[PDB]
Design a protein around this ligand. Structure first.
Ligand SMILES: CC(C)(C)OC(=O)N1CCN(c2ccc3c(O)c(C(=O)NCc4ccc(C#N)nc4)ncc3n2)CC1
Ligand SMILES: [Mn+2]
Length: 197
């Protein structure tokens, strides 16, 4: 029921808060398969872009298609964005070496990315021992939000200056897939801007 989810939760949740969490996105079996697909690429070789239709990246493609389907079902009711495209999936490994990520904005200079979309692959993850908590600071709010990189969790937020985020140090290696959805007008203007100067 993606139509229920998008329209009843994601959209109003995003328009009010700029951040939306969807736990238990694909289920245990589906998630661990995506987890296993990532672990395979890490070890063998076969921060890298995955198109979605490679050998050993099928369930990654399902995730992406699922991700996409939810975006479709929002019916262009996320802000006033015309999402007509996205990046490839960034499959990254995040070491457990007690280093955290400095507070940043994902899209600071209007390159076209309007929505950050992140899926976490950390089974039985316990931030109380392992760390790696995401702190987001909604630009014009009295509160900030700590968010665990929990298994089978899907996280949406505005990529722009509204959501600066840092990640606390972790003491165990982490896996997450990230996708950025483009606004049509914004992405168009950035392309011409680059070429025109
Ligand atoms: C094609 C076009 C020019 C549009 O985009 C690019 O070329 N990009 C997009 C921007 N970009 C990156 C790369 C990396 C980025 C990045 O780790 C973050 C970010 O908040 N990371 C922290 C983090 C996230 C998950 C987990 C887990 N579990 N632990 C820590 N946030 C933002 C990040 N942005 C570099 C590649
Ligand atoms: Mn970021």
């Amino acid at each position: 029921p993606a139509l229920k989810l998008a329209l009843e939760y994601i959209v109003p949740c995003m328009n009010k808060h700029g951040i939306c969490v969807v736990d238990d996105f694909l289920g245990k079996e589906t998630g661990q398969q995506i987890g296993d697909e990532v672990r395979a690429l890490h070890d063998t070789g076969k921060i890298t872009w995955i198109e979605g239709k490679e050998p050993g990246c099928e369930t990654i493609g399902l995730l992406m298609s699922s991700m996409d389907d939810l975006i479709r079902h929002c019916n262009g009711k996320l802000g006033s964005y015309k999402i007509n495209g996205r990046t490839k999936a960034m499959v990254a490994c995040y070491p457990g070496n007690g280093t955290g990520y400095v507070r940043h904005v994902d899209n600071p200079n209007g390159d076209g990315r309007c929505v950050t979309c992140i899926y976490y692959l950390n089974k039985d993850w316990d931030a109380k021992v392992s760390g790696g908590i995401l702190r987001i600071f909604p630009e014009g709010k009295a509160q900030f939000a700590d968010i665990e990189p929990k298994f089978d969790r899907l996280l949406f937020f505005w990529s722009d200056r509204r959501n600066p985020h840092e990640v606390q140090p972790a003491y165990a290696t982490r896996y997450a897939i990230t996708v950025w959805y483009f606004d049509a007008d914004e992405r168009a203007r950035a392309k011409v801007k680059y070429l025109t100067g």
